[PDB]
């Protein structure tokens, strides 16, 4: 990378975007975990009914 003050600003902007992307991915994964645990209960429930059927 060519060393100029403009490049320094551009790279700093890139760093900022990288962090603000990491946190967004983390929020999405948290939503996914909520959905997954909501599914696991009804999954084991269907397994229960299958066992008793």
């Amino acid at each position: 990378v060519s060393p100029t003050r403009m490049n320094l600003l551009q790279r700093r902007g890139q760093l900022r975007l990288a962090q603000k992307g990491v946190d967004l991915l983390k929020k999405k994964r948290d939503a996914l975990v909520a959905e997954f645990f909501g599914l696991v209960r009804e999954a084991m429930e269907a397994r229960k009914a299958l066992d008793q059927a």
Binding site: F36, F37, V40, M44, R47, K48, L50, D51
Partner: protein, 104 residues
Amino acid sequence: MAVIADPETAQGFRLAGLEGYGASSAEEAQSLLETLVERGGYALVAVDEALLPDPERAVERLMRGRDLPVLLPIAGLKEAFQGHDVEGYMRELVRKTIGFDIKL
């Protein structure tokens, strides 16, 4: 559809319009399920847990890219009287899925 299970239950599956068969071994099951999933005119096949716990280790090589035939372990003839440990199964599932043993 299709089920690889004890032929006495296989006739009941026929009563439910589902062809089934079996010969009580993992190797023969994996052998002929190759044809079964090549002659897979249905979307799901069942296999008892005692034949082999995980059908993925078996059909994963031939089902590559294709998703219709879903395969799952189903209660066996011993479970016909005893039952099953449902929560242990779910918990060893979520263990490998979300990385750890949870909901304890």
